[PDB]
């Protein structure tokens, strides 16, 4: 439900480090 690169279908992933 909330993180930063993780899922496939709601809306966070991944996206720098």
Same mark, same amino acid.
């Given at each position: =439900? #909330? &993180? #930063? &690169? %993780?899922?496939?279908? =709601? %809306?966070? %992933? &991944? %996206?720098?480090?």
């Amino acid at each position: =439900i #909330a &993180s #930063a &690169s %993780c899922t496939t279908x =709601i %809306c966070t %992933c &991944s %996206c720098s480090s």
